[PDB]
Design a protein around this ligand. Structure first.
Ligand SMILES: Nc1ncnc2c1ncn2[C@@H]1O[C@H](COP(=O)(O)OP(=O)(O)O)[C@@H](O)[C@H]1O
Ligand SMILES: Nc1ncnc2c1ncn2[C@@H]1O[C@H](COP(=O)(O)OP(=O)(O)O)[C@@H](O)[C@H]1O
Ligand code: BEF
Ligand SMILES: [Mg+2]
Ligand SMILES: [Mg+2]
Lengths: 49, 77, 434, 430
């Protein structure tokens, strides 16, 4: 369908002039890993104490 | 914008015209750029057109130059 | 405009779909067997199932060894973790050498991850302890259409109050990491003061809560150093811990066990993925026998990715040894686990071709007769000497206001520059160590 | 679900002995070395015997003969729950840790201790949560009904449990696990989980640990992160004495029991004489694990001395240890091991190509063919055929040169490379 082409042309126009396609630039957040291997051994340390 | 005031205003305080984007420009660009083109102009009119590389703009402009810019119906690469 | 140094002329190995090395492709001449072996390494690492194999390049000076390393790095792509290394820098003054070896081996292993963060933004309307109270503060963020109140941890509120935020201040606050940051003051208060150092910014658009997936890549070494020691923090205890020890420390075996177990769990979850890396070490002959006998076990590891080496010597004594003279300065035990790719030197025609190609990328034009000259004296001294003299010849043409390097230009260039052979010869006739 | 890839030792899973210490010729990927495998069974009976300690055994032989493979197979035969330690002789050489206490820690980590503790667990689906309290005075009285397949019981929760329940957000249909002593809460699924049985399930929790961890913990309050990061060092020997006495009395009263571990050390020929003497003196320790030596180097000069001791080790170490060696491999052993490589790494090598690879491995080396069989996979699939033929093997042989071929190549190309003095000729004319 030509309307799909017209839509794609609209996003091309809105992204080429400026990065306005949802304009999400990552803030570079760190990984927030929650394993905390020390938690797997704090119980053992408490039992030892 | 193209449909904001680039139709019939008589601005004459400038001497340069810049076109950021023109998807369908067999006619609209002419009146948009000539809005500043007025009798009360004592200097030449510079027209700047913005195109990118390996994009739709470059393909459209080059194919318009190939066919003397008659009418664009299908854009592909 | 453009910057280069003996490289960047490589855009790839220059093979075909069948694995045959084209005579001239990707700015490469000769070394057809070497290029085909490099492609063998290419589809070895593309399989990403092999582990613990060592491939080194055996060649003399100007044999394209590190040039081949640049080629393989270029064809690897940004996604593939390539870690160039120098056999001399492995000697560490603060930590043991084998720790550095394991550290770079773990650096070589990379792994893509997917994650989603929670973003909150807006203007805080209240900063008050909840009520008979404790070190918790309710904060109400107002966006363009977002209107929510939040009760926060004592540490994140401590970071907030160290940010010197107030009412009418629009801030950017994250939920997972908890990092605090104020965007500024709302434009509604711009008129309140005629002058102010603080800049006024509009209220955040949309609703306060935000979601987005992140596909950021991370090497296993980065995770190991992340869970080995803290990295950042806006609360005072974070700096307390960081300043408790800035010294880099080794990694226990059980730490590696637990990190590989947790990444195995994550990849079993279906989100995490693993991609091996390539380790290139310059002049592996420079390091000592201690690293060799440690690599005797390190090569036999499981997660140890493919490693590529190089050397520039032959039947030479091994470092740290007296009677142990070995080819390439590598003891036989490791070479039994090593595979070699033979390299070949370059004669007149290919030397001329590489010089003219790098002159084309040098954006310097050389006439045919000057090309014949640079082919001539680029052989009896070295190709590298003509490679160096290329730029001065162009600049001498430029000084003469000509755009073509002529035979006269290379003539004065070789007259006013002397090679290693000429330096040694003039040293032969020395009055006081001339 | 361990993360394992193809490796020089990943094929073998267990030694494959018999009840009477009879090694099957092809067992668990381990082939050949009948005497070596019988000695492996002997050291097995040593390690699960447990009643002996302070035994040192030496395993030597030619390079690439699989003594490391023998050790890996032994470790696989031990299986899980047996503390096994594998390390080379280069890791000990460090600047932040001197050699002697590093070896002391290596001995210390070997032996493990089993700790058996009983825990009280309350696990059942919740019906609703109702916490009584004061608007500004506290006075928290939390109540919540807990249900399962066979009870529907209301519980009055103390301050700590409802403080936690406020810390982690839970809903009525959510199921949580409650332990009385710790007071921690663990929720895994929602009405996902189908709890059953009694709420007051009385099940034990058993934890294993080497005495190294408890030593590090007792050494310093920072010992937790110290062992988590390895930046320990020079623990006072009085701590070692007191912890040894404490675990001794624990053994007599039986609350915890020790598991004598297994230590593997490689490249002992590069070990220092001070370390040799430390081993000689620490072998007499009652808490001395069963350790085997892997020396791939024959007659050589011991480090720190100018004397060329046999096997690269001083005779003082050899006197209080037993020695067994390993032999070469006849062509059928190469055939079997390359067949195991082909099945393990999924190579459908042609029979004639298999014989050619067998020959190339026999004359040159085993690992050369072990890598040729891997490279033949892509050398074949580049032409889009799953099977691998003779021409692929020959292509791999000619492409990747051999060690002896390179030696010969450099013997008539000495001037091409630098010499011991470092001189090298780069010009192609005169
Ligand atoms: N096939 C080739 N095509 C173009 N240039 C090459 C080729 N082989 C080698 N060179 C050039 O020779 C130089 C020597 O390569 P390099 O590996 O960096 O040093 P060495 O060969 O002494 O280790 C490089 O700067 C590279 O540009
Ligand atoms: N009987 C065997 N069964 C299976 N693999 C073997 C056998 N003997 C030798 N190998 C292989 O030969 C290789 C020899 O490597 P390694 O043991 O490190 O050398 P060395 O024997 O000199 O210590 C091992 O990786 C192993 O896979
Ligand atoms: F008013 Be017009 F047509 F410029
Ligand atoms: Mg190089
Ligand atoms: Mg070995």
């Amino acid at each position: 369908n030509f309307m799909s082409i017209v839509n794609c042309l609209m996003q091309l126009r809105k992204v080429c002039n400026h990065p306005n396609l949802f304009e999400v630039r990552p803030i570079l957040t760190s990984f927030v890993l929650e394993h905390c291997v020390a938690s797997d051994y704090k119980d053992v340390e408490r039992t030892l104490l | 914008s193209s449909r904001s005031g680039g139709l019939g205003i008589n601005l004459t305080g400038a001497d340069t015209v810049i076109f950021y984007d023109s998807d369908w420009n067999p006619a609209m660009d002419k009146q948009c750029q000539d809005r500043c083109h007025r009798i009360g102009q004592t200097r030449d009119v510079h027209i700047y057109r913005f195109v990118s590389e390996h994009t739709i703009e470059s393909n459209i402009l080059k194919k318009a130059n190939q066919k003397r810019q008659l009418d664009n119906v299908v854009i592909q690469e | 405009v453009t910057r280069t140094a003996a490289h960047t002329h490589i855009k790839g190995l220059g093979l075909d779909e069948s694995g045959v090395a084209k005579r001239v492709e990707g700015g490469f001449v000769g070394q057809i067997e070497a290029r085909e072996a490099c492609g063998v390494i290419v589809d070895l690492i593309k399989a990403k199932k092999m582990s613990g194999r060592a491939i080194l390049l055996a060649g003399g000076p100007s044999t394209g060894k590190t040039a081949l390393a640049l080629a393989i790095s270029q064809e690897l792509g940004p996604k593939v973790p390539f870690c160039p290394l120098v056999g001399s820098e492995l000697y560490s003054v603060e930590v043991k050498k084998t720790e550095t070896l394991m550290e770079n081996f773990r650096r070589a292993i990379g792994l893509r991850i997917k994650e989603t963060k929670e973003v909150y933004e807006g203007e805080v309307t209240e900063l008050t302890p909840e009520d008979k109270t404790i070190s918790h503060v309710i904060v109400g963020l107002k966006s363009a259409k977002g209107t929510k109140t939040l009760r926060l941890d004592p540490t994140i509120y401590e970071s907030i109050q160290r940010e010197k935020v107030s009412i009418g201040d629009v801030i950017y606050i994250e939920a997972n990491t908890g990092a605090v940051k104020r965007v500024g003051r709302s434009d509604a208060y711009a008129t309140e003061f005629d002058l102010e150092t603080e800049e006024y910014v509009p209220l955040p658009k949309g609703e306060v809560h935000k979601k987005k997936e992140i596909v950021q890549d991370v090497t296993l070494h980065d995770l190991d150093v992340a869970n080995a020691r803290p990295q950042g923090g806006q609360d005072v205890i974070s700096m307390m811990g960081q300043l408790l020890k800035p010294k880099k420390t080794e990694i226990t075996e059980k730490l590696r066990q637990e990190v590989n177990k947790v990444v195995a769990k994550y990849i079993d979850q279906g989100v995490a993925e693993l991609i091996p890396g390539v380790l290139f070490i310059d002049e592996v002959n420079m390091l000592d026998i201690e690293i060799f006998t440690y690599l005797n076990k390190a090569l036999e590891s499981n997660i140890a990715p493919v490693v590529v080496l190089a050397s520039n010597r032959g039947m030479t004594t091994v470092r740290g040894t007296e009677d142990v003279i070995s080819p390439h300065g590598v003891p036989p035990d490791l070479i039994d686990r090593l595979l070699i790719v033979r390299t070949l030197p370059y004669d007149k025609d290919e030397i001329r071709t590489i010089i003219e190609r790098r002159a084309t990328v040098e954006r310097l034009q050389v006439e045919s007769s000057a090309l014949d000259l640079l082919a001539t004296m680029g052989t009896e001294t070295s190709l590298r000497y003509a490679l160096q003299l290329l730029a001065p010849c162009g600049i001498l043409a430029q000084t003469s206001n000509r755009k073509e390097i002529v035979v006269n230009d290379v003539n004065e260039a070789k007259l006013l520059f002397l090679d290693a052979k000429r330096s040694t010869k003039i040293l032969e006739t020395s009055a006081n160590y001339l | 679900k361990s993360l394992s890839l193809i490796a020089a030792h990943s094929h073998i899973t267990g030694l494959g002995l018999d009840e009477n210490l009879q090694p099957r010729p092809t067992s668990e990927g381990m082939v050949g070395q009948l005497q070596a495998r019988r000695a492996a069974g002997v050291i097995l009976k040593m390690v699960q015997n447990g009643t002996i300690a302070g035994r040192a055994v030496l395993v030597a032989g030619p390079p690439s003969t699989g003594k490391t493979a023998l050790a890996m197979g032994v470790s696989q035969s031990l299986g899980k729950d047996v503390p096994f330690t594998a390390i080379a002789g280069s890791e000990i050489f460090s600047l932040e840790l001197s050699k002697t206490e590093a070896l002391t820690q290596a001995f210390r980590k070997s032996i493990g201790i089993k700790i058996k503790e009983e825990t009280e667990l309350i696990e059942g689906e919740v019906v609703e949560i109702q916490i009584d309290r004061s608007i500004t005075g506290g006075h928290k009285q939390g109540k919540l009904t807990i249900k399962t397949t066979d009870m529907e019981t209301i519980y009055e929760l103390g301050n700590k449990m409802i403080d936690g329940l406020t810390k982690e957000k839970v809903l009525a249909g959510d199921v949580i696990s409650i332990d009385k002593a710790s007071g921690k809460i663990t929720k895994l699924g929602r009405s996902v989980q189908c709890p059953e049985g009694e709420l007051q399930k009385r099940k034990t929790v058993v934890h294993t640990v080497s005495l190294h961890e408890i030593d590090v913990i007792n050494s310093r309050t920072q010992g937790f992160l110290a062992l988590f990061t390895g930046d320990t060092g020079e623990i006072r020997s009085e701590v070692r004495d007191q912890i040894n006495t404490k675990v001794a009395e624990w053994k007599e009263e039986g609350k915890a029991e020790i598991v004598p571990g297994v230590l593997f050390i490689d490249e002992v020929h590069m070990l220092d004489i001070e370390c040799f003497s430390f081993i000689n003196r620490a072998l007499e320790d009652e808490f001395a694990p069963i350790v085997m030596m892997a020396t791939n180097r024959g007659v050589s000069k011991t480090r720190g001395t100018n004397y060329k001791s046999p096997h690269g080790l001083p005779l003082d170490l050899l006197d209080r240890s037993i020695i067994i060696t390993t032999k070469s491999y006849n062509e059928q052993e190469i055939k079997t091991i390359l067949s195991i490589r082909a099945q393990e790494e999924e190579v459908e090598l042609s029979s004639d190509a298999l014989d050619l690879l067998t020959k190339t491995g026999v004359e040159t080396s085993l690992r050369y063919s072990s890598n040729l069989i891997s490279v033949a996979q892509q050398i074949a699939m580049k032409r889009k055929n799953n099977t691998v033929e003779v021409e692929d093997v020959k292509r791999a042989y000619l492409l990747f040169l051999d060690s002896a071929r390179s030696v010969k190549y450099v013997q008539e190309n000495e001037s091409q490379y630098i010499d011991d003095q470092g001189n090298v000729q780069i010009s192609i004319a005169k």
